[PDB]
């Protein structure tokens, strides 16, 4: 009767909706496509940020532990662990441990994280994680471990340095860093020194 | 050079985006990504043409699993037609219909011209709808009652695109029969047209 004369509306054959197609795409692909949606729309990163909770320090530490375990077990069957061939096999996994450290550690550094007691706890965990890295016969493969010690040293410094201007200082981990630097073949010297200095 | 650079000391930041999204499974990624398209519609175009489309068989597989998932959701050994059972299953029930609603249109005119294919799908969709669960309360049967109505219209459009077009394929006249007989006859409109066209 009214404006337009109607008669049983027959369905229209439309295209598969967005939700349905995303179902047939997994974690990798989703994640990967999502990372580019943000690259195109930076503002998205803030929303998601306010949507996803930051994993707890313990969660993070638990991740690195799992990450280095993956490495130890990725070593080939019955061969030399310090071997070159044994290296190529674990490379990927190795990089994974390292890439995590680069990600996580900055969360517990000077401007961003001002909590001294926290940051140390993570540096300690982190350094121990680095103590475990695999050595090799070839001097090239070991460069990633020493490099790790170096950068690692930089962080302990910056972390301690926030104590400089800060009145009221705790009882810094002299014994922990002492052993830390020892296991490290003295690479952490500079940090051990500043520790004692400030202390 | 121009700046007096010393040994670089690390600077603190918030763990990168790639890291944060590592502590979330396909569910959340799926969801949050969905909201991104809602706020930035232009994102759908980019994600569309680059995503792997599910084949007919896969879609069909999805439905089976769904209703097979909905059949196990029924409480212990209670009355599978009581109201209580309905609740514990409304959701898994609805999932079946949503999936039907999404996928079915994907095989009608405008979009799908290939008659010999659409019939194939609708056939498998009607069977899914036969399988739906009946209940004592009459209010919980409108969903399945309505389903039958919709697919009726759905076969109509499919059969209609076989009009002005040359020749007349071998219509599933013998198929819709067992379908309309099973659907307690509320699918006759589409079948009366079958014998008609045919």
What dihedral do alpha carbons A165, A168, A171, A173 form, nearest 10°? Answer: -30
A6 close contact with B: CB closer than 8 A: no
Residues 6+ apart with CB under 8 A from B186: B145, B148, B149, B152
The residue among B11, B29, B37 with the most chain A CBs within 10 A of its CB, best to mutate, is B29
Burial class of residue A38, CB neighbours in 10 A (0-12, 13-18, 19+):
middle
Distance CA B80, CA B134 (A): 9
**Window B:27-86, CB contacts with A under 8 Å:** 28-30, 32-37, 39-40, 43-44, 46-48, 50-54, 58, 62
HEC string for B68-91: HHHHHCCCCCCCCCCHHHHHHHHH
Report the domain count for chain B.
1
Residue B36: closest CA among A41, A93, A97, A168: A41
H helix or E strand, kind and range, residue B197: helix B188-197
Task: Give the nearest chain A residue to B109 (CA atoms).
Answer: A13
CA A97 to chain B, closest CA, distance in angstroms equals 13
Burial class (CB in 10 A: 0-12, 13-18, 19+), B114: exposed
**Side-chain-side CA neighbours of residue A89 (13 Å):** 19
Phi, psi at A162, each rounded to 5°: -80, -5
Which residues, in sequence order, are CB contacts of B66 under 8 Å at separation 6+?
Answer: B92, B95, B96, B99
Q: Residue B105, class by beta-carbon neighbours within 10 Å (0-12 exposed, 13-18 middle, 19+ buried)?
A: buried
Task: Return the closest-CA partner of residue A25 out of B65, B30, B45.
Answer: B30
CA of residue A173 relative to chain centroid, distance: 24
Q: Are B140 and B115 in contact (CB under 8 A)?
A: no
Residue among A9, A13, A106 minimizing CB distance to B107: A13
Q: Which chain A residues contact residue B186 at CB under 8 A?
A: none
Note whether B170 contacts A: Cβ–Cβ < 8 A.
no
- Within 8 A by CB and 6+ apart from B68, the residues are none
Q: In which domain, by residue range, is B149 found?
A: 1-198
Q: How far apart are CA B17 and CA A49, in angstroms?
A: 9
Q: Which residues pair with A13 in a beta bridge?
A: B110
In three-state secondary structure terms, A13 is: strand
Q: Considering only residues 109 to 168 of chain A, which have any Cβ-Cβ distance to chain B shorter than 8 Å?
A: 109-113, 151, 154-155, 157-158
Q: Contact at 8 Å (CB) between A11 and B108? A: yes
Tell me chain A's radius of gyration from C-alpha atoms.
Answer: 25
Residue A142 CB neighbours (<10 A): 15
Q: Return the CATH number at B153.
A: 1.20.58.1590
Minimal-distance CA residue of chain B relative to A38: B36
Distance between CA A174 and CA B102 in Å, rounded?
64
Q: Where are the alpha helices (DSSP H) in B9-55?
A: 17-20, 26-39, 42-48
Is B157's CB within 8 Å of A13's CB? yes
Q: Cα–Cα distances in Å, from B158 out to A128, B71, B148, B153, B176?
A: 67, 30, 15, 9, 13
Judge: B9–A151 Cβ closer than 8 Å, yes or no: no
Those residues whose C-beta lies under 8 Å from the C-beta of residue A112, and which sit 6 or more positions away, are: A106, B12, B13, B14
Total residues belonging to chain B:
198
Please name the residues in contact with B136: beta carbons below 8 A apart, sequence gap of 6 or more.
Answer: B79, B81, B82, B83
Contact A38 B15 (CB under 8 A): no
How far apart, in whole angstroms, are the C-alpha atoms of residue B23 and residue A31?
Answer: 11
Say if CB A159 and CB A119 are below 8 A apart. Answer: yes
What does R_g of chain B's alpha carbons equal in angstroms?
25
Burial class (CB within 10 angstroms; exposed 0-12, middle 13-18, buried 19+) of B193: middle
Closest to B53 in 3D by CA, of A37, A20, A34, A13: A20
Chain A residue numbers touching B55 (CB-CB < 8 A):
none
Neighbours of A23 (CB within 10 A): 13
DSSP state of B138: G
Method: X-ray
CA distances from B5 to A148, B9, B71 (A): 21, 11, 69
DSSP string computed for B144-178 = HHHHHHHHHHHHHHHHHTTSSSSS-----HHHHHH
Coil, helix or strand at residue A162:
coil
B19, A158: Cβ pair inside 8 Å? no
């Amino acid at each position: 009767e009214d404006i337009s004369k109607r008669a049983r509306q027959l369905p229209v054959g439309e295209q598969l909706p967005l939700s349905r197609l995303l179902q047939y795409s997994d974690k990798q692909q989703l994640f990967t496509i999502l990372l580019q949606c943000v690259e195109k729309h930076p503002d998205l990163a803030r929303d998601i940020r306010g949507i996803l909770p930051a994993p707890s320090m313990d969660t993070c530490v638990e991740t690195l532990r799992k990450l280095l375990i993956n490495l130890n077990d990725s070593f080939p069957y019955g061969g030399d662990k310090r071997g070159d061939y044994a290296f190529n096999r674990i490379r990927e996994k190795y990089m994974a441990v390292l890439h995590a450290l680069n990600d996580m550690v900055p969360c517990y550094l000077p401007p961003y994280s001002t909590c001294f007691e926290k940051n140390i706890t993570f540096l300690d965990a982190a350094t121990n994680v680095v103590h475990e890295l695999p050595e090799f016969h070839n001097p090239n493969h070991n460069v990633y471990k020493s490099q790790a010690y170096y950068e690692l040293t930089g962080a302990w410094l910056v972390v301690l340095r926030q104590l400089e201007d800060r009145p009221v200082v705790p009882l810094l981990p002299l014994e922990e860093l002492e052993e830390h630097n020892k296991t490290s073949q003295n690479r952490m010297e500079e940090a051990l020194n500043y520790l004692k200095q400030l202390q």
